Each structure stands twice: as C-alpha cells, then as structure tokens.
Prior knowledge:
The structure is a homodimer.
Chain A (H helix, E strand, L loop, with lengths): L2 H26 L12 H14 L4 H15 L5 H26 L11 H47 L12
Helix pairs in contact in A: 1-2, 2-4, 2-5, 4-5
Keywords (chains A, B): Coiled coil, Plasmid, Signal
Protein name (chains A, B): Complement regulator acquiring protein 1
Amino acid sequence: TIASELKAIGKELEDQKKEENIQIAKIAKEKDFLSTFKIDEDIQMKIKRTLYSSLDYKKENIEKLKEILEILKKNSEHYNIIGRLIYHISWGIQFQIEQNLELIQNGVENLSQEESKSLLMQIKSNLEIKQRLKKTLNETLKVYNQNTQDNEKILAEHFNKYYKDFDTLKPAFY
Amino acid sequence: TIASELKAIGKELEDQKKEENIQIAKIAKEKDFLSTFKIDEDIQMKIKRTLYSSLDYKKENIEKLKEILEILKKNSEHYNIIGRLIYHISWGIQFQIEQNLELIQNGVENLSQEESKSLLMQIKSNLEIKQRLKKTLNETLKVYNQNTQDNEKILAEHFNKYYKDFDTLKPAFY
C-alpha cells in the first residue's frame, strides 16, 4: 500500500483538472490562441489544458508562445517539428494522464501488486515528463526574450554608430 | 556658368517634390506612420518627405522602419539618439534642401561667382548627405532583417534540440 499514495495523487489530479478548466475559461474570457491552430474541440482542449499549466496560465508567457508559434509557421519545412511539439508531445502526455486518472475512478481497490504498482509508476513518469516539458518551455521563453533583448541592443548600437550627426552616416560611395 | 547645371538641378528638385507629395498622398491612402510621432504638421511633412524618398516609398521597408522605431521607443534612455535621427538629421536636411530651392525660384540669374557657385556646392553637399542617409537606412534595414532571420533560426535550432520526442526535453532536476 501505495494505495494511500495513489488515492491522494488521484485527488490532486482531479483538483488540477478542475482548476485547469477554470483557468481555460478565464483565458477564453480575455480574447486564448488555441481556440484555433494548424481543428478538433477536445483534441485541442487537452493541448490547451497542458500548455496553460506549463505556463502557470501566465498571460504574457502564453502570448509569447503564440508569437513564437506564428514565427515558426511562416516557414513550411518546420511543420514537422511543430507538430511533434503540439500533437506528439503536448496532447500525448495529457491523454496519458487522462487514461491514468480513469483507472483511479475505476476505484483503486480492485488493482494489485502487479498492476496497481505499475499504474503508480506510470503516473509518476507522466508527472516527471510534464515537469520536464514545463522546464523546456521556460528555457524556450528565456531564449526568445534574450533574442528580443539582443535585437534591440544591436539596433541601439547601430544607431550610436551612425545616427549621431550628419558626418557619421555611411559614406556615399561604398 | 554652372547656371545651366543649376537650373537643371532646380527643375529636378521640383519634380521630386511633386512626386514626393504624390507618394505621401498614396501612403496616407493606405492607412503612413508619420501621421504621428514623438507633433506639428509641416515639421512632420519634411521628415515624412525625406524618409519615404530614402525608402523608395517601399511600403514594406516603411513598415519595418516604423517597427524599429517603436522598439527603440520602449526604452527611455534612447530618446536622444532617436531625436537626433528624426529631428536633427532627417528634418534638417529637408529644410536645407527647401532653402536651396527657394534661392532657385529667386531666379538663378541674379547670383554671381561668389554666391551662385557656393549655393551650387551646398546643394551638391545636401544631395550627397541625402544619398548617405539612404545608404545608412538600407544598412539598418538589412541589420534588422538579419536579426529577424537569426531569431527564427535560433528558435528552430532549439526546437530541434528539444521538441523531438519525450526523452529529449530538459531533464527534470536541473
């Protein structure tokens, strides 16, 4: 037993789901860009579910993510990687979680050492994966922010170099 | 004489002005962001005049420039440099040009070796400066575009590194 742990875990998951739903609703109420993307309702609910938890539903971060996605889209070849992120990674984990959860509202009592334990392990793994994804997302965000900073910095530098005074512009013949 | 050259130059300038006006009108008709900035009508007409000629009135380039300006704005300290670009460089040249032009619709005939010649020289200098500015603008645009490219590239790289498959995300404990 295990079982004590398991029940608690299940409870936590349910709580999260409740809160997840609430957060989704809130997001929707503020205009929530997974309202569409490259189209199915519940195949996007999960994806939405997961992405917002990964970002602590933090509107700014979500916006940034959306922007990044848009940027990515504007090249054809990248499609694959983007799909993998969204559909393979992001949906799949959610699906797994849901499956696990169902087993818990099948009652934990009926399970056993060969299959309760296994289930628990699976759940733990899923949780770990989720955490990892969150971390990755954060990293990505950082990178994006850095880039944004960098561009600005470069522009400023350029301005300093050139746009002081007439006699500091490019020379007319090169 | 000189004077033959001068008259031609004047004519050219007038033509440009005509065409400049036309281009401005066209820009306005497409939504022309120097309709406002950090407010006076004719102190912006010139600035508008000059900037659009520098960009061959090319809408895309104009848009890019506007974006760059916006980016710059979002830091307080830069104000000075931006002002220098706009008000010191961009207006000033236009003003100079206008002044020169007036002297030509004062008739070239009344002028002389000490002051016709000087005027001509000044005009030439102004033209050179304009050309230089254009070049500088182009350079800036390039830089901006490069940055934009770069960011995207970096993002793609990051995605490749991470968002393949579950087991390629950040590790959960670092």
